[PDB]
Amino acid sequence: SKGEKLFTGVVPILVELDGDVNGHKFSVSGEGEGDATYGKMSLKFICTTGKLPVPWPTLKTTLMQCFARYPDHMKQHDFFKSAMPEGYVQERTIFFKDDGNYKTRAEVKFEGDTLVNRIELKGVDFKEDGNILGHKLEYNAISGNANITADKQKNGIKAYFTIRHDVEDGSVLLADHYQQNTPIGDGPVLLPDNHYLSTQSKQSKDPNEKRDHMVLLEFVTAAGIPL
């Protein structure tokens, strides 16, 4: 594969999410730019249906690991770019401790020069008086590691990690992520040695934006193999 050559410059990003959580339906759209040379994504997401019925932080991991910076010595472990431009399917289950779960399915692919992330999200067994449907989570930055492993049987990768969401009562809401990625195309892909993606995030608002929205500046770096 020569998928990595598609990311050497600034790439426009389009995101589309259709969600249903305990029957509360919503849509999100997002745009921005990825600059994988520096591991960077600059993004803005809008709830297109009015008020988001779950907190923005709970959707962040769902709303493009193809934009990670793999250091030169780790290039042979970058499944995400190797699958381009045909793309990959990303599936997760996210278990919120003592609350419901999200089941997600996404297709991440190029549509001409645009990297498009099209997502379906289904959430069930949430508590209406809980920290999620009750909107009791802090609007702050999520940072941390995604652990990546080869899935030889599916010619893809699996990932796992736990996000710690701050609750406005000073407690923490744990969100256990289980991830599977499979190439959409039939061509060759890179199957990695074990490693992780480290994300640094800055979360903000646009003071001119009336719509329910999220602004992110993300930097994502591959790590866990020396040299």
Author numbering: 2 to 64, 68 to 231
According to the publication:
Recently, a fluorescent protein based on an anionic tryptophan (Trp) was developed and was named WasCFP. WasCFP was further improved to enhance its stability across a broad range of pH levels and temperatures, incorporating 13 additional mutations. This improved variant, which exhibits strong green fluorescence under physiological conditions, has been named NowGFP. Spectrally, NowGFP exhibits green fluorescence (λex/λem = 493/502 nm) at physiological and higher pH levels, contrasting with cyan fluorescence (λex/λem = 429/475 nm) under acidic conditions (pH < 6).
In the case of the orthorhombic (P212121) crystal form there are eight molecules inside the unit cell, and two molecules are in the asymmetric unit (chains A and B). Similarly, we refer to chains A and B in the orthorhombic form as Orth(A) and Orth(B), respectively. Two of them come from the arginine–aspartic acid salt bridge between Asp180 of Orth(A) and Arg168 of Orth(B). The evidence that Orth(B) has a more unstable structure compared with Orth(A) or Mono is that the r.m.s.d. from ideal angles, average B factor and solvation free energy all show the highest values for Orth(B). In the case of the Orth(A) and Mono structures, the key residue Lys61 has ∼80% k1 conformation and ∼20% k2 conformation under a high-pH condition (pH 9.0).
